[PDB]
Amino acid sequence: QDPARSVRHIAIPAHRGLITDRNGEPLAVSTPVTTLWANPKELMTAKERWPQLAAALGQDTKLFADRIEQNAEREFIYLVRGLTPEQGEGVIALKVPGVYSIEEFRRFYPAGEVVAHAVGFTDVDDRGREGIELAFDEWLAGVPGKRQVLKDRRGRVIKDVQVTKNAKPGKTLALSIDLRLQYLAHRELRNALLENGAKAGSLVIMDVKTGEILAMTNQPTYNPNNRRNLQPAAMRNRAMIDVFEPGSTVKPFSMSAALASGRWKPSDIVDVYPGTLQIGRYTIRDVSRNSRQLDLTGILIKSSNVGISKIAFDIGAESIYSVMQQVGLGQDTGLGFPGERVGNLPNHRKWPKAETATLAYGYGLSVTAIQLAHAYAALANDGKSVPLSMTRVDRVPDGVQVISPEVASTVQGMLQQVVEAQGGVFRAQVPGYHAAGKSGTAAYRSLFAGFAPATDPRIAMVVVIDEPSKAGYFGGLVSAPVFSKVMAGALRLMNVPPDNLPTA
């Protein structure tokens, strides 16, 4: 016979660590629940109790009975996982022979859909599946304990023996996300999609000095507390997973290389007439073709592919590739989110003219919205690229000085003109502040990337609107007004003073 007594092991689930926003607002909270297990050998002695037990478990009478009967020779099965503690005590109070309980936890997400992708969610086993819950799973999960119970020959629990290993609680995590800014970004991106009839979109806000991600929202979104019917489209963390060719939004990096070469200054003029440039078989074409001479700021205002290409041929692709690589376009962010996409930054030993030109005006490389925002953050932070963080930064790390402060300041002023000057991106203007930025077109994505205050930058932001299909309230670039609204609120939520003084 089997021994009259045996010492069996039961895991002790650990309490998963609290996730908060940067201000301590709870974002993911472990909630006590009760799991019930049973010894079928004992249940088989108390069959008249089964229907009441099945009812208390929310299970069908006959499906429940079938399950016990088919497991009659086992000494352990789960009856139900994750009942409320109240529902649990109700089941336990039936006093059915062979019914036992385990204290576990399940997550609740107080901000729900507002921060769905960034926070992510746990699986049925309380394990991180998406977002920060996934990226920091080991930190948040801790380590289960193990305890021993004395059982008899038929698996009846006689008593607790001891705990052999205590559970190590999961550890707390404060995100860089500011829920105040995340709500503003979530609301405005949702409104922009509705008014533009768009498929999807993303918005990222970064602190340019600290590398912190202050907001990251995508549409569609979902309620992580109720995923019954959640469609895969909604679950996608587009800001980190969708790659696209950034188009004219990378011209400022080409310009930074031009100004660093020693060969170009902002007042220089390039003749871009007639809005095309033939290089062998290939023709470089501007979208708008109403220009002849443009200064360097003009090339940006007009999104002149021709103009930036002539500059690129003069300075060489290598110098542009170097800046783009160093600011992180097509490069690992270091954020450690499994499944994050890196995109691609093409390299060559001998750069063909077509590849040089297209790199310079943003085709042939592919990036994510996070990378684009980090790149603009370096430009905004006087050329210093601080590593990205999704967690609160108290001690600011050194950044790599990727662009000289002087070149960065010059480009900031050019991008301020892109927003402010006649012919520029009118609806990107941020009332009460000077803002700086650049539009582009990634079945298209509308892109806007920028920062503010333009003369002393604090915040960088990228807006991506995927496949707009309906006319919005304002004309012009679809993503521009979203930048305007979100930047206006974010700057004020952060108490950033206006930089548009009357000449002081």
Curated annotation (Swiss-Prot):
Induction text: Mainly produced during exponential phase of growth.
A single GO molecular function term of this UniProt record: peptidoglycan glycosyltransferase activity
InterPro entries for the chain: Bact_Transpept/Beta-Lactamase, Beta-lactam/transpept-like, FtsI_transpept, PBP_dimer, PBP_dimer_sf, PCN-bd_Tpept
EC assignment: 3.4.16.4
This protein's pathway: Cell wall biogenesis; peptidoglycan biosynthesis
Physiological role: Catalyzes cross-linking of the peptidoglycan cell wall at the division septum. Binds penicillin.
Similarity remark: Belongs to the transpeptidase family. FtsI subfamily.
Localization per Swiss-Prot or TrEMBL: Cell inner membrane
Keywords from the named record: Carboxypeptidase, Cell cycle, Cell division, Cell inner membrane, Cell membrane, Cell shape, Cell wall biogenesis/degradation, Hydrolase, Membrane, Peptidoglycan synthesis, Protease, Septation, Transmembrane, Transmembrane helix
Record field: catalytic activity: Preferential cleavage: (Ac)2-L-Lys-D-Ala-|-D-Ala. Also transpeptidation of peptidyl-alanyl moieties that are N-acyl substituents of D-alanine
Pfam family, one: PBP_dimer
Database matches in HAMAP family: FtsI_transpept (MF_02080)
Organism: Pseudomonas aeruginosa (strain ATCC 15692 / DSM 22644 / CIP 104116 / JCM 14847 / LMG 12228 / 1C / PRS 101 / PAO1)
GO biological process: cell wall organization; division septum assembly; FtsZ-dependent cytokinesis; peptidoglycan biosynthetic process; proteolysis; regulation of cell shape
Protein name: Peptidoglycan D,D-transpeptidase FtsI
Bilayer topology term: Single-pass membrane protein
Record lineage: Bacteria, Pseudomonadati, Pseudomonadota, Gammaproteobacteria, Pseudomonadales
Keyword Transport: no
Active site (record annotation): 248 (acyl-ester intermediate)
Source species, domain of life: Bacteria
Main location per the UniProt record: membrane
Gene Ontology CC terms, in alphabetical order: plasma membrane
Enzyme class, UniProt record, top EC level: hydrolase
